[PDB]
C-alpha cells in the first residue's frame, strides 16, 4: 500500500487480523506497521493556497 503523508502515533485500537483503516469516502487514515504490529495514524502533510 503506497502513499505519502506524515505518520504519527494513534490511540485507536484495531482488531488483531485487521491491518489498515479507512474513513468515510474510502480514504486511508491509519495503518498497522508489519514489523512491530503497531497502529500509526496517517495524515497528509500540510498543503494549501498562498
Amino acid at each position: 500500500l503506497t502513499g505519502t503523508g506524515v505518520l504519527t502515533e494513534s490511540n485507536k485500537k484495531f482488531l488483531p487480523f485487521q491491518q489498515f483503516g479507512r474513513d468515510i469516502a474510502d480514504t486511508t487514515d491509519a495503518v498497522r506497521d508489519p514489523q512491530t504490529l503497531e497502529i500509526l495514524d496517517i495524515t497528509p502533510c500540510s498543503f494549501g493556497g498562498v
Partner: protein, 420 residues
Amino acid sequence: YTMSLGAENSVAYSNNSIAIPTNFTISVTTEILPVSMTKTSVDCTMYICGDSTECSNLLLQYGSFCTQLNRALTGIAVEQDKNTQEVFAQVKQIYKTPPIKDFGGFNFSQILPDPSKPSKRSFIEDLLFNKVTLFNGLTVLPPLLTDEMIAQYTSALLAGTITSGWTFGAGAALQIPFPMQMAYRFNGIGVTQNVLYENQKLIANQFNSAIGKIQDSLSSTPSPLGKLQDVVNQNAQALNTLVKQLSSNFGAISSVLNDILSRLDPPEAEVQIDRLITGRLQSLQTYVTQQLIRAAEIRASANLAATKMSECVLGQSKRVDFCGKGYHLMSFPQSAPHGVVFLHVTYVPAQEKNFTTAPAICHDGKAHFPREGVFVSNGTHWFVTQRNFYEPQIITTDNTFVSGNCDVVIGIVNNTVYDP
C-alpha cells in the same frame, strides 16, 4: 386515498350582513431562509493528477480548464461572502439595549444576548446552532464573518428595532417608548392606538406566550430547519460523490496512476492516463456546474432574505403574507449556522360576531358615509366602528361625511345622525 384539500365550509354571505372580530391574537411565526453555503475551492491539477509530473505535462497540453474551474469556484466563494454581508450588515452602528429592560411587560430575554457569554448568543440562536449538526486537492475556506459577528449584527438590529422602531433603518436611531411603537404599528394595520393602550397587559402576555411556544417548538419539535440541513446535505453529497469518482478507472485497467505507470509501457500507459484525465476532468466540470447552479439558487434565497430583513425588520410591511400569516406587526432576526431565522410578530383577528350593515345613513334627506369605519347594526341601534376591531360608537357628524341626498345609494337606511 384521495387527499382532502382541507375543511370544507361555506361563508354565511348575506346582502346586509358583516362579521367583525371582537378580540385578537398576537401570533409569532418562524421563517427559515438559507443565506450562504460552505466555500469550497478545489485544486484542479492535484485532484486530476495527484503530484505526477507526466500527468501534469499531458494535462497542461489538454487546456485551460483548471483556470476556468478555479475562477468559477473563487467567484462562488466571493458571492457567498457578499450574500452574508448583504443580508446581515444593514446597520452602520452597533446598537445596544439599555440595562433596564422596562418594555411595558414585553419580554425579550429569550432573543436578546445573555450575560452567560455562550458566544454572545440567546436561546433561539443557541437552540438553532445546537439543532443543526454538521483532502486530495479540495479545501474549505472559512467565512469572512464569524458566527460571533453575525450574532452581534443580529443583536444590533434587534436592539435598534425595540429601542427605535423603523427610524434607524431610514436614518438615525430615535428612541421611542415601546408602547408607542406598538401603537404606531397597530395604526399601520388599521387599528387605533386605544386598543393597545387598553389591552397592553393582554398583548404583552400573548407575545410572551408566543415566544415561549416558539422556544418549546424549537426545543422539542424536529425537522424545523430542513432548508439549512438540506443545503448542507447537498453540498456534502456533491463532495462525497466527487471524491468517489476519483476512485473510478473510467474504463482503464486501474484507477490509480502509480500502478499504471509501474506496470505498463509509456504509450498505452499514457493512453490510460489520458482516459482517466478525461473522466476526472468531466466529473470535476459536472461538479462545478452543479455548484454554480446551487450558488445561483442560494443567491436568490439570500436576496429574498435581505429583502425580508429590510422590509420587515427595518420597517413594517403592508404586503400580504410576505412576513407571516396575518397583519404584520414586527419582525425579529436570529442567526443560524448558514442562514437567518425570522420571528414574525403578526396580528390575527378572533372571536368574530355577525352584524347587520348599511352602505350609508339617510338623515335629514342627505346621505352620510363613515369617514374610516363601518355602520354596523345592533338590534337596538346603528353604530359606527372600525373594520378590524369591534368598538361601536354613536353615529355623529364628527365621524361621518355627507355626499348628497339618499335617493341614489342602494341599501341606505334611515337613522339619526347625532350633532354635538
